């Protein structure tokens, strides 16, 4: 999650706090996951080989 989030605390009652996103700065690219294209292709190749049996 490239964003630099800023957690903010809200006192909703005696002793109880609610943690809220007050501000968001930094890299605003959407959260993502990277899987190596070469490694995933050869892993599906192994899965397919064992799946044709």
């Amino acid at each position, epitope marked *: 999650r490239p964003n630099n989030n800023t957690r903010k605390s809200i006192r909703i009652g005696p002793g109880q706090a609610f943690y809220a996103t007050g501000d968001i700065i930094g*890299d605003i690219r959407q959260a993502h996951c990277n899987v190596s294209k070469a490694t995933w292709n050869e892993t599906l190749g192994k899965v397919v080989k064992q799946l044709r049996k």
Partner: antibody, heavy 127, light 107 residues
Framework: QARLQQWEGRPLKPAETLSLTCGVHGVGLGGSGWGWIRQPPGQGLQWIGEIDHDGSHKHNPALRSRLSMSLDTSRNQVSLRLTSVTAADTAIYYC??????????????????????WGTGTTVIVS | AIQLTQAPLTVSASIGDTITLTCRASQDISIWLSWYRQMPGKAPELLIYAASTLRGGVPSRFSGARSGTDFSLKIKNLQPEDFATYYCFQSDSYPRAFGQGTKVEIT
């Protein structure tokens, strides 16, 4: 009608505590950050220090361990407590509001602080 | 820290001219550089923030440019209220710094 008012503290003896106070009207201490800017006579401006929106105290490296600032949220006042004042500290002290606007570079979002609102001036002379 | 170099330290022009002020930074401070004008005896006021955005109320004559190292400010249609000392202030690194100050006067 939003203004920052600060009043003269009169000349002070050398090697003492420099107590400043800025009056914030029109707006309040919350959300922005509040700092201090000086100006020695016949010279340019100098950054002393600021408190940012987070409540975190940025201080100038030149003034080491003699800096201390506080915010009076109840009275809407910003305080400066420079200690061990030397003759070189004779300058007009300004109270400023470092306002945060977010500017979007190609992919990066930043909080940009740009001293929106300036005080009137407190001529501090030590002799 | 970052050192801002502002030259020329004294530029003179008559009413109704165009001047360009230069503020050179040490490192690359992106576009975070604001401009302040100090009328003699008064308090400094914000003209331009982020090196390009005009403050609310500043006339459209004032304008900045550049997002690298050689920041510039251009004044058009000079008026007596523009003959003051201008300062460039960076906001990239927390050891904040000001410019030396360009005193604009009449010839």
């Amino acid at each position: 009608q939003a203004r920052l008012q600060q009043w003269e503290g009169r000349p002070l003896k050398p090697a003492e505590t420099l107590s400043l106070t800025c009056g914030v009207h029109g707006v309040g201490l919350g959300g922005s950050g509040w700092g201090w800017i000086r100006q020695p006579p016949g010279q340019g401006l100098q950054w002393i220090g600021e408190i940012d929106h987070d409540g975190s105290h940025k201080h100038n490296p030149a003034l080491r361990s003699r800096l201390s600032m506080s915010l009076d949220t109840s009275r809407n006042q910003v305080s400066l407590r420079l200690t061990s004042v030397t003759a070189a500290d004779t300058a007009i002290y300004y109270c400023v509001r470092v306002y945060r606007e977010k500017f979007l570079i190609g992919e990066f979002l930043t909080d940009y602080r740009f001293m929106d609102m300036w005080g009137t001036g407190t001529t501090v002379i030590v002799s | 820290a970052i050192q801002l170099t502002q030259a020329p330290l004294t530029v003179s022009a008559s009413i109704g001219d165009t001047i360009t002020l230069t503020c050179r930074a040490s490192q690359d401070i992106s576009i975070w550089l604001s401009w302040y004008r100090q009328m003699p005896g008064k308090a400094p006021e914000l003209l331009i923030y982020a090196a390009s955005t005009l403050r609310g109320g500043v006339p459209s004559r004032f304008s900045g440019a550049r997002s690298g190292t050689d920041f510039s400010l251009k004044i058009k249609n000079l008026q007596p209220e523009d003959f003051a000392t201008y300062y460039c202030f960076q906001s990239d690194s927390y050891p904040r710094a000001f410019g030396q100050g360009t005193k604009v006067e009449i010839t």
